[PDB]
Every structure is written in C-alpha cells, then in structure tokens.
Amino acid sequence: RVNSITAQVIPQSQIVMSGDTYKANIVLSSVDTTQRPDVFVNGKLLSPENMGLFTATAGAPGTYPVKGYIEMMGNDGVKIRRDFESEYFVTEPMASVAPTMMNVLYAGIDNPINIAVPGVAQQNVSATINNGTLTRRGNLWIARPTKVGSEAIISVTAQSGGRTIQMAKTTLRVRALPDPLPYIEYKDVQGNTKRFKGGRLGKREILAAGGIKAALDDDLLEVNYTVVKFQLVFYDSMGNSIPEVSDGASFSERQKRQIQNLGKGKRFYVTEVIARGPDGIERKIPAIEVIVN
Amino acid sequence: VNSITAQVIPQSQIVMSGDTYKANIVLSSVDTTQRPDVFVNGKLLSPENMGLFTATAGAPGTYPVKGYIEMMGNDGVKIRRDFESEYFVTEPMASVAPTMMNVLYAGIDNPINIAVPGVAQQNVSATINNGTLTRRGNLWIARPTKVGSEAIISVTAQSGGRTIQMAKTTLRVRALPDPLPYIEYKDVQGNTKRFKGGRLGKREILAAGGIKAALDDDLLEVNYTVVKFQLVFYDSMGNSIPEVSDGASFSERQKRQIQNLGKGKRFYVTEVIARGPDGIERKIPAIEVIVN
Ligand SMILES: [Zn+2]
Ligand SMILES: [Zn+2]
Ligand SMILES: [Zn+2]
Ligand SMILES: [Zn+2]
C-alpha cells in the first residue's frame, strides 16, 4: 500500500549547550499519503483537519507523555490499529530577557530568582550570592540581600565534568524597600473600598476608617507597611495650630471628638506620619490635606 | 508482507516553555526481512544504537547532521533516502531572572537585555504584543502602550529549517511612579539639601524659587517638573487662605505672605501638580512648612 518512503532526523534538541550531547533518532517512514487514519492521543481523538499532526503548547517545564493509538481501514475491511507511547520534555528558555530598570533586589524580603540552566538538572547547579543569602525553595531560589547600595553578584556553576564550570555572573542592584504613601481607607455610597488622596471626603466616611494606613501606589512590589504613629493638625479662634497625637495607627479620643465638632469645608492635616516596612525600619512619610464634605 | 508500526515523529523532543510541541503520528510499514543501514556524519550506526545518533557538543557553532538510510527494495535494487539536518552548540549559560521584577513603564524607553549567549545579535529577533520593541546597539527598547495590561516578549532564532522559539517573557505594563515634592535649599556652608517637610529657616525658604519634584531612583533616571501648586496659609481668625503660584515658582502674593509669617507659624503646599517624561500631569503629596 506504501507510496512514500522518507528518512527523518528527529532530535532531542536542535540547540545543545557545549559539553552536553546532541541526540537524534534517525528513522524511515514508509506511509500511504492517500489514507486519513483515526489518531487517538492523550484522551482525545484528533480532528481530521489536524491531518495526523498532534500539537500541545509547552507550559510548565517537565516530562509530558504522548500516548494513544492509530487506526485505519485496511483494503480488506479489517481495521489496522497500532498503539504508541512516546514523550516530550518542556524546559526553561535558553534566552535571557532582562529589562535593565528591573535588575534589583530588596533588603528585608524574599527575592524569588529563577536560576535556569538548560541541559543540566536542577540538582547539578549551584548558585551563590556575595551580598546576603541565596537559598533554594522548590524549583526557585531566594535572595535576601543585606547591604543596601552595594552590588549583588549571583554566581551560577554546573560542574558536569572534570573541572567546575562557571555558568553565569549576574550583577543586581540592592535597594531598601520604598517608602509608602499615607491613605484613608473608605467605602463609597455603593459600599466599594477606595483609598483617599486626600483632597475632599465626608466625615461619616472619615470616622468609618478609624485611622491612617500606609502602602505603596503599586503593585510593583506587594509589601506591608504599618503606621507606627501620626499627628492631626487643627486650628483655634486665635489662628494657632493645635497638633494632636494619635493612639498608634488609630485616631485618639481627643482627635475623634475634634473631627466630629469640626464642620463642613474645614481643613485638617495628618503630619509626622511614621510608617514601618518588613525590614523594621521606621520612616517619615508625606502629609495629607483633609477637607470635610 | 512485513509488520506495520505506529510512529510519533516530533519536530523536537525538547520544547522550551512558550513554544509548541508538534508531532506527526503515522502508520509506517516496516520491512522485518533485513535491517536498514544508517550512515550519518561519516559513520554507520551500529544496530545497538537503535537509530539514535549522538555527538558530544564541543565548540559553539552550526553543526550539520547529514547522511542516508539504505535498504533492500525487494526488487534486487537498493533504495536510498538522504537526510540533511543541523544542530547548534551554544556557550554554556544560565539565566538569572528575579521573578517579581517584571515591569515595563509606559511613556519611556525600557532598555531590555535579550541575551542568547552562543548566537550573534543578527540571529536573534524579538517581538512584543504591547507597544514597540526596537533595537538600539547591543540592547532592545520596549515602549509599552497599554497600562495595566500584559507585555509578552517573544525571542526567536529562526534559521534552517524550522523557526525555534527561544523565550516567551511575561511582563506588566505600569505607569511611571509619582514623584515626591521638595524645596531645594543651600545650608550655611553652601551645600544643597532637599526639604520634604518639617522645620526650615525664613531666608532659606525664599531661595530657591518655588517647589521641585523628583523621584529617587538610579535605574529610572527620569526627571519631573512642577506644573502648578497652591500655598494654604492661616490668618488670626483661623481661616484658610489658598494662594495660587506662578508655575514652579512662588507668586509675589505667596512670597510676601511668607515674609510676614512669624517663627513657628505653619503654611502648606497643596495641591502640587507635576509632570514627567510620560508626559502626564499628576497630583503629588503635600508639605507642611514651619518657619524657624
Ligand atoms: Zn543532555
Ligand atoms: Zn524517560
Ligand atoms: Zn488483513
Ligand atoms: Zn500615581
């Protein structure tokens, strides 16, 4: 029945790292291009439109099996069926795509770093850092840099031979975690949570918050900042400034009363706002203008 | 009449994440009478190799895989099928990527280092799905356009015969950060310092001109200008007096109002609108100014 004999070079990978080995299966395919056989692969029957080609988008790295059967109608009316069991491997990319405004590490938090060596298993690799610690966590690494304003050099080595081979020297910048901005967490007329600029806000909506909260604008950077202490500035009949201290990240009873008896259009300020990041460093963050409405 | 066999013929048995595994599944009619001969790169494969040809990767470059498969065509005539493929050896590398740090900023040039160590820059050609990704010397420049959406950088090597996907990188497009306001002043020695609030001298307020805005970042070497601001003063009757400014400089109204303020008296800088290389105008925080 065959009308087409073809030689094929089927490699494991078309790109190999120096020192690894190129492996290719060389096979003959004697087929009948007239036929359209039923291909059941990985619990699915291929649609005739696929023309025998099975495709799967490579997602997470690992060992993926290709298992099923092929069946076609023989010339005699006897179905001819053949089972198969093959496999493919998904790897990490062998191209580094690094935005330079992103090569940074933050002191005080876990910095997940993906150290990927193609052609070598995750165990054969060893990675070290010159600033802080670089430990393993599952399929990832964790950098905890200690010296802010200095460089962090990640040194990756694989060995896989007689002499220990250097794979990559990566220089990264060490920064303190950013300073947060203060805000007042409030629920709108619908009930949805919004974060005050300041500018203008209702007193019913002010007292609902119960204090000052501190966080970053982003989303860069998913970090917790707590308000240590803050002050509220008020104004008497003599035009003098009255700075009232707060009970931590919550309004004091002296302040709470002042806000109630204040009145619409009247302005108050939140000054000397000290916030604390995971690194434990207390930091002076900016002020907010609060207008009653 | 000899045996029929199922065959899974992939493009590659190893696929990098982001690429797609492609395999042709066929019924092949194998002759069990005689074993064929596989001659590849000047060597005849021994039956023990089971069709597997292996070569140790040495110096980086383009290596060809060439040869033929010979067999008896049942008609006293030997049949030959030639094959010609190739592999690439690369300088041994490792990718060190901090996973949290995946942001591109809209409104500026985002230098991206796309490194495929073994190959040369001509060989590599990267594309982006959000904005533009152009070449600049030994680097690439992403200019993302849609804030809050994803930016997927696709790096390819193309070449003969098949087009190989090198990397698919997921990035987040975010707006440039907002700067913080400051008043630039020279101390008693002449050294420049930046006041962000708290207490400050009278003559030292008068110099410099008005308010300045900046972000402190040595990677994002961007600059912002103060568009407009207000100074909110307080009289003897406890009333708020909001005086507008002449751009990034104090107005003659504000200047004289600061002059008649006694020691300890408080005034504010709110609102404060600043724009960057974006170039987007943005409401930045306020400053409490106390006279010394
Ligand atoms: Zn290998
Ligand atoms: Zn296996
Ligand atoms: Zn039959
Ligand atoms: Zn913003």
Domains of chain B: which residue ranges? 1-34, 35-94, 95-176, 177-292
Do B155 and A97 lie within an 8 Å CB cutoff?
yes
- How many whole angstroms separate alpha carbon A14 and alpha carbon B85? 9
Please report where in the chains the tokens 């070569």 appear, as a residue. B55
Experimental method: X-ray
Two tokens, residue A155 = 């040194």
Do B164 and A14 lie within an 8 Å CB cutoff?
yes
Q: What type of residue is A126?
A: S
Ligand nearest to the CA of A22: 1
- How many whole angstroms separate alpha carbon A184 and alpha carbon A182? 7
Do A84 and B7 lie within an 8 Å CB cutoff?
yes
3-state SS, chain A, equals CCCEEEEEEEECCCEEEECEEEEEEEEEEEECCCCCCEEEECCEECCHHHCCEEEEECCCCEEEEEEEEEEEECCCCCEEEEEEEEEEEEECCCCEEEEHHHCEEEECCCEEEEEECCCCCCCCCEEEECCCEEEEECCEEEEECCCCCCEEEEEEECCCCCCCCEEEEEEEEEEECCCCEEECEEECCCCCEEECCCEEECHHHHCCCCCCEEECCCCCCCCCEEEEEEEEEEECCCCCEEEEECECCECCHHHHHHHHCCCCCCEEEEEEEEEECCCCCEEEECEEEEEEC
Of residues A2, A16, A237, nearest to B87 (C-beta) = A16
Of residues B81, B218, B220, nearest to A28 (C-beta) = B81
Q: Which residue of A has its CA nearest to B71?
A: A28
Check if A158 contacts B (Cβ < 8 Å). Answer: yes
Of residues A27, A99, A172, nearest to B7 (C-beta) = A27
Two tokens, residue A290 = 């609060």
> For chain A, how far is it from start to end, CA to CA, in angstroms?
87
Please report where in the chains the tokens 């050099």 appear, as a residue. A153
**Which residues between 106 and 135 in chain B have a beta carbon less than 8 angstroms from any beta carbon of chain A?**
110-118, 124, 126
Q: What type of residue is A244?
A: E
- How many whole angstroms separate alpha carbon A106 and alpha carbon A173? 9
Of residues A24, A218, A286, nearest to B285 (C-beta) = A286
Ligand 1 center to residue A119 CA distance, Å? 5
- How many whole angstroms separate alpha carbon A72 and alpha carbon A91? 34
Q: Which residue of B has its CA nearest to A54?
A: B23
Read off φ and ψ for residue B49, nearest 5 degrees. Answer: -70, -20
- How many whole angstroms separate alpha carbon B192 and alpha carbon B189? 9
Q: What is the dihedral of CA B243, B245, B249, B250, to 10 degrees?
A: -20
The C-alpha of B203 sits at a distance from chain A's nearest C-alpha, in angstroms, of 22
Two tokens, residue B174 = 């975010």
Q: With contacts defined as CB-CB under 8 Å, which chain B residues touch A140?
A: 99
The C-alpha of A82 sits at a distance from chain B's nearest C-alpha, in angstroms, of 5
Q: Which residue of A has its CA nearest to B148?
A: A219
**Which residues between 46 and 65 in chain B have a beta carbon less than 8 angstroms from any beta carbon of chain A?**
51-60, 63, 65
